[PDB]
């Protein structure tokens, strides 16, 4: 057989769901492209990884044509 | 210089005879000239830029504008050509400087074409613009025959505000364009 | 016999046959049809034997339709071997047929003729079948 | 081509990497030392 290979599962996906309490640092989404875009108080690292910029809670936003967004609405 | 015989002839001759012929309600609706683009397809200069600058030298002499040097969009083996390399020369002349150029094209150049019984009455691209191809750069008055090293023509693209070329035809006609009927 | 040229992938899983005919499904070209009562893999060589049986019993005119197509690659080891080390090998193609599907279907022939042909044609198939005419219902489009 | 470019006194050796035969010159560029701050930095060894 010429096959037999594969790579390590990269455990990608959302790490904090809407209405979850996070903290400045907490990475909120692990993804390949820009499947989710950084919203309010949400940074995104060189591997497109979204994280809380401040403490607070997590909320999602589907801006249709404009894509989907993860916001960290404060409370801190 | 904002005089020019043809620029004059357009307003005080062509423009009126066009209105009573098509019946334009507005002032702008009547076809204006704009933009005359001259483009030398010069593969002749694949691996030698030395020959590409002599052409530009020539093109600016007849137009009054230094042309821009187009470059190959993609690599295309068969006839050399990779993604780079200067593969053409092009200048876009507009109002005024276009007028003085278009005037000598009618009153000197075309007249100096070996043969010539008129320009092609089908080169209108449908949406009212006209294109014509010349076969040598000696038909222009500025050229001395003793500055040439080899013959290279060019493409001329004249663009009009006229929505149809049925009208675009009249404009060019009345301007003094020698059509083969 | 009858295989689909140019394929993105040769050798494909096998999946199940729990379906019930995606559709289909209601006759749409001829005057009469052969409908599948049971699910099965119909082999290109089974289709070709069903087609021929008809064009043959039709003097030569005739006007089949088939409507099912062998696009699924059927593999099979070289026998006398053991499991492991690659997969099947591809020894033909099949068409997936769940109940409801209309296979074949003929037109431009008498009834006592078309119905006799479809019966013959049906004996060449590994499943149970049914002959139909085509009424309003069929005009589902 | 593994590369280790340095400063211009007390050495330093904050190593980088130039792959080829071009850049093939002195292969130098402005960088910052752990000591004072921001100096020339040249390439060697």
């Amino acid at each position: 057989t010429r096959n037999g290979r594969d790579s390590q599962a990269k455990r990608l996906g959302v790490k904090r769901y809407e209405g979850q309490v996070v903290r400045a640092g907490n990475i909120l989404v692990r993804q390949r492209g820009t499947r989710f875009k950084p919203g309010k108080n949400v940074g995104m690292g060189r591997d497109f990884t979204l994280f809380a910029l401040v403490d607070g809670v997590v909320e999602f936003q589907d801006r249709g044509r404009l894509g989907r967004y993860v916001h960290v609405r404060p409370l801190a | 210089p904002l005089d020019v015989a043809l620029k004059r002839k357009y307003y005080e001759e062509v423009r009126p005879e066009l209105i009573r012929r098509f019946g334009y309600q507005n002032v702008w609706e009547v076809p204006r000239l704009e933009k005359v683009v001259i483009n030398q397809g010069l593969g002749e200069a694949k691996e030698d830029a030395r020959i590409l600058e002599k052409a530009a030298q020539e093109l600016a002499l007849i137009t009054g504008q230094k042309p821009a040097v187009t470059r190959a969009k993609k690599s295309i083996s068969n006839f050399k050509l990779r993604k780079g390399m200067p593969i053409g020369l092009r200048v876009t002349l507009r109002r005024d400087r276009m007028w003085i150029f278009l005037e000598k094209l009618l009153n000197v150049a075309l007249p100096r074409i070996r043969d010539f019984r008129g320009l092609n009455p089908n080169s209108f691209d449908g949406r009212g613009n006209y294109n014509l191809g010349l076969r040598e750069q000696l038909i222009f008055p500025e050229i001395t025959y003793d500055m040439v090293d080899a013959l290279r023509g060019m493409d001329i693209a004249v663009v009009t505000t006229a929505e149809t070329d049925e009208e675009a035809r009249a404009l060019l006609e009345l301007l003094g364009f020698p059509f083969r009927k | 016999m009858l295989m689909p040229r140019r394929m993105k992938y040769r050798k494909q899983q096998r999946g199940r046959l729990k379906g019930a005919t995606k559709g289909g499904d209601y006759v749409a070209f001829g005057d009469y049809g052969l409908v599948a009562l049971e699910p099965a893999w119909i082999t290109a060589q089974q289709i070709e034997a069903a087609r021929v049986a008809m064009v043959r019993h039709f003097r030569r005119g005739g006007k089949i339709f088939i409507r099912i197509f062998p696009d699924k690659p059927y593999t099979k080891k070289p026998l006398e071997v053991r499991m492991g080390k690659g997969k099947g090998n591809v020894e033909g193609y099949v068409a997936v047929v769940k109940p409801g599907r209309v296979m074949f279907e003929v037109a431009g022939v008498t009834e006592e003729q078309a119905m006799e042909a479809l019966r013959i044609a049906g004996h060449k198939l590994p499943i149970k079948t049914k002959i139909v005419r085509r009424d309003a219902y069929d005009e589902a489009q | 081509l593994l590369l280790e470019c340095t400063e211009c006194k007390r050495r330093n050796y904050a190593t980088e990497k130039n792959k080829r035969n071009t850049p093939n010159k002195l292969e130098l560029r402005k960088y910052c030392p752990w000591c004072r701050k921001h100096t020339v930095h040249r390439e060697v060894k």
Partner: protein, 66 residues
């Protein structure tokens, strides 16, 4: 236009089978063109000089009377 890198472009003269073309406006004022066919010489002002159509007609008349 950008400064330098340019031809001057200046009101000019011209010559032909005609007389004069004041219009011009081009580098190298005063030019002698072989034949400006705009003045009226050549094709336009349909001269049709050295007229033709001998062909049939020619062998026709040296034939009707030979």
């Amino acid at each position: 236009m950008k400064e330098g890198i340019h031809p001057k472009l200046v009101p000019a003269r011209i010559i032909c089978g005609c007389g004069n073309v004041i219009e011009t406006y081009s580098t190298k004022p005063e030019i002698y063109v072989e034949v400006c066919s705009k003045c009226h010489p050549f094709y336009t002002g349909q001269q049709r000089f050295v007229d033709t159509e001998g062909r049939v007609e020619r062998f026709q008349r040296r034939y009707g009377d030979s």
